[PDB]
Amino acid sequence: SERPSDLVVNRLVLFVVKGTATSTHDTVKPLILLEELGVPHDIYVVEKVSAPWFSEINPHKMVPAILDRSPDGRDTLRAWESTSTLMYIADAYDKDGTFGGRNVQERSEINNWLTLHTAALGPTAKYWLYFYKLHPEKLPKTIEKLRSNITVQYDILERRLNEPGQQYLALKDRPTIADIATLPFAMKSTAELFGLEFEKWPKLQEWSVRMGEREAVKRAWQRVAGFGHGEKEYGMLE
Amino acid sequence: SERPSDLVVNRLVLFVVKGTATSTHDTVKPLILLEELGVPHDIYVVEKVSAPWFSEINPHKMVPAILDRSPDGRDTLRAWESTSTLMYIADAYDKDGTFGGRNVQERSEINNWLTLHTAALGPTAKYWLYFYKLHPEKLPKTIEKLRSNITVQYDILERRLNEPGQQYLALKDRPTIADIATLPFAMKSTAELFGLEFEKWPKLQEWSVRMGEREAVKRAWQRVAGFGHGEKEYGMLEA
Ligand SMILES: [Cl-]
Ligand code: NA
Fold first, then answer.
1. How far is CA A54 from the centre of its chain?
2. Helix, strand, or coil (residue B14)
3. What are the residue boundaries of the GST C-terminal domain, all occurrences included (chain A) (predicted)?
4. Which site from A91, A233, B51, B100 is most exposed, i.e. has the minimal number of CB atoms within 10 Å?
């Protein structure tokens, strides 16, 4: 339907919701990359993701979502699903491939570890959270199986980070969109939410701290928590 | 670990298992794109995905997986997760971006619909199949919720294919890796396996038929069924 009056696309617009402990694990992903690359962007706090105008941007009716001017300015582009928002930002703004990958060999590993998160840990974690908190009935056997699957995903990330010189998931030398996608679901606070001892994956914990010490990541976590708690509650932030 | 004697990487090697109705819906995806682009490749039929040598290729211990030579031909690289195998094959072999997308605009929509399948329909369908067939105990409330989530994904795809001129999921004009990734989980036979009536999503059904009519798609479906049922059951198949 008709867009809100304050929704204008002069630059990349990242769509988020009010910052809470449970609302920021996916929206933080594109924000980390925007902060890493220093991309000019606006923040739009969505009051209701069920709103018809928003389903025209993201048919899956969730944040994060992006509206942006196409390189030639002929079209308004959109990105939705948190992994797709990372792919878009990398494609449009990371022309060096510092986070997207510079060659076929780099991208091969980046896309392996990015897709592993997109297909396995990400959806498993979101099904765990749904059945644990959101489902009207509690199904403990389903929850236990999903928690078990999370430990297997942590085992895989741990095995990778135990390989000689492998400081990051995809590339030995530097973090990539694979690392950004994985971090919010592979840190101590999220491990504790799942009822897991994160010290049981030492190389994964080290990696999460290494990622956490990055200035862009610190800025992203600060800002995503604050969205919708400033002077403006909903709509285009200033 | 120790590789099997017959595993050599002289070109792209696609790792599959013995063809059944429920063993081919992810392995067929890279095979469709290989057939579309006419990429030279070998097929390796894995007997046990639990084999230590295989986990060195794919730590997730599943098919599809790819071993291939690097562009220069000095080194060997790998792709695993079906979506990743599509991204790799497009990156290495689809230089025109016929299926990968030719510009930032095309790739924005290709990645939206590809990631929707990778994150939503794909994992939901796999968890449905797991709880329905593989889990030692049948959990009908879990299976029903997953089946319900599949109908929501079908609703999203139907909405997209009801938009004016939108013949394919990502692009209006031609199919992409987004369409290839989606097809095996959005076709009549799969809809019947889930216990759904696929005619409830008319534009989605028409799209699945349009995709199914493509020669490359037919060849991949025909080939993926036969892997491990020929004169060689497991290991590197003979062309
Ligand atoms: Cl249960
Ligand atoms: Na049609």
1. 19
2. strand
3. 103-236
4. A233
Tally helices (H) and strands (E) across chain A. 10, 5
The token pair that represents A131 in the structure block:
């059945």
Tell which CATH classification among 3.40.30.120, 3.20.20.140, 3.30.420.40, 1.20.1050.10 matches the domain B104-217: 1.20.1050.10
Do A16 and A64 touch, CB atoms closer than 8 A? yes
Sign of CA dihedral A55, A58, A59, A60: negative
Report whether CATH 3.40.190.10 matches the domain A104-216. Answer: no
CA–CA dist B206, B75 (Å, integer)? 43
* Interface A:B, Cβ pairs < 8 A: 132
Shortest Cα–Cα distance, B29 to chain A (Å): 15
**Alpha helices, DSSP H, located in chain A:** 28-37, 52-57, 82-93, 104-116, 122-129, 140-161, 177-182, 188-193, 202-212, 215-226
Question: Measured between alpha carbons, how far apart are the two ends of chain A, in Å?
Answer: 25
Closest A-chain CA to B66: A108
Both tokens assigned to B230: 């020929």
A142 vs B139: CB contact, 8 Å cut-off? yes
**A235 has which bridge partners?**
A45
Distance B191 CA to ligand 1 centre (A): 25
Q: How was this structure determined?
A: X-ray
Q: Phi and psi dihedrals of B235, rounded to 5?
A: 95, -165
Which ligand approaches the C-alpha of residue B161 most closely? 2
Q: What is the resolution of this structure in A?
A: 2.0
d(CA A68, CA A30): 13
Residue reference for tokens 């056997």: A141
Strands (E), chain B: 12-16, 41-45, 65-69, 76-80, 235-236
Mutate to test the interface with A, among B62, B69, B112 (most CBs of A within 10 A): B112
Q: Which residues of B touch A (CB under 8 A)?
A: 59-60, 70-71, 75, 77-84, 87-88, 91-92, 103-105, 107-109, 111-112, 114-116, 118-120, 122-124, 127, 131, 135, 137, 139, 141-142, 145, 156, 159-160
In this structure, how many other beta carbons lie within 10 angstroms of the beta carbon of residue B235? 15
